[PDB]
Symmetry: C3
Subunit: 151 residues, 3 copies
């Protein structure tokens, strides 16, 4: 069932955020721990970000789960939408407003074998200049686990 | 294993609500898109609602997942309870108060093969006349994905 | 079957667990709670009627642990509580609450070798000393707790 997984332990400085009003992925942050991967999974070519890469994935139905402590809008009074994104399709949209997100789940289907397939956490802020954040800065506490189940 | 799935893409006017103080399913809204189904799944006989039907389902243990952006109480100051319901048992109860639900998960088991088995999202308001809502009115942003896994 | 086992506890007046540990801690036995119902490999935790599930044995592999519970929350306004799933060695599925509730937790756990006497716990931590974090299933016919482990 487990196609692959990716685990990133918290580390000072490992915080992703942007104020894009359109959905956008996060980008590499040098301070992050390298993620440990298993199975068919690898780090995204974009580097240390909330995401997971499958160089090869067979046709089929998949459930993607992101466990992250945690994601939230940085400022009060700001609404942030988050989604899981494979470059083409999205699933598992969620929102945060003076609140946090700790888990996202998405359903994805492929009729043909995939190559170089990356799943991303994306976010959009509903107030320009106000950031949406994914935060694993506290060692020993914060953690991200991403894993893909073949159904 | 993925027993079946049901996907409805968002569309203006496709929102469900009621103000029942007893748990109740939502009812057909004609503006909604026709859902697409895979595997053993079909649309509820009640029509375009948050739910999924299995004309036949083997004995077994099953995890039901509902991904939906989004469900919320229409008015501020109003508490809404939501549950997953198979006609006999409930699972995965959640609440909302000036807040949203994006996902629901339930565990259901059957000792014998089932026929005409429908799973429903149900809701109950804690203030009469004040509605609980499920809302997929924004095309390209909102979507409902319901799927059942055999454990 | 990938369902290694499950544990179910139906709501009952007085079945509420709470503490104010500033460090992550499990809950302890509450006498007013219903006894749990279990399936598969699972058993009730040796600590008693608590948010948790026990696996007297579990083969090496990868597992997803789900807790469905209506509900967990900080007792007081203005207090932040963290919850996490714990197997005595590692944690997963950390969640938080603040004038809000938790209804589901999910964790990913892996074992390179066969496990014996393995218990999974819901643990909590308050960020305001002396202010309780609670798991509440005191309403009969409405509240309940379902815990289950799936082999991946």
């Amino acid at each position: 069932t487990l196609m692959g997984s990716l685990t990133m332990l918290g580390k000072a400085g490992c915080q992703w955020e942007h104020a894009n009003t359109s959905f956008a992925s996060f980008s590499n942050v040098v301070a992050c721990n390298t993620a440990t991967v298993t199975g068919l999974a690898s780090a995204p070519t974009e580097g240390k970000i909330p995401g997971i890469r499958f160089a090869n994935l067979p046709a089929g139905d998949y459930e993607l789960t992101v466990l992250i402590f945690s994601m939230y809008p940085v400022d009060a009074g700001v609404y942030c939408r988050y989604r899981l994104w494979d470059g083409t399709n999205f699933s598992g949209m969620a929102g945060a407003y003076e609140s946090e997100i700790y888990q996202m789940t998405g359903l994805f289907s492929y009729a043909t074998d995939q190559t170089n397939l990356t799943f991303y956490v994306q976010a959009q802020t509903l107030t320009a200049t106000k950031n949406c954040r994914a935060d694993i800065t506290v060692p020993g506490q914060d953690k991200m686990q991403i894993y893909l189940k073949k159904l």
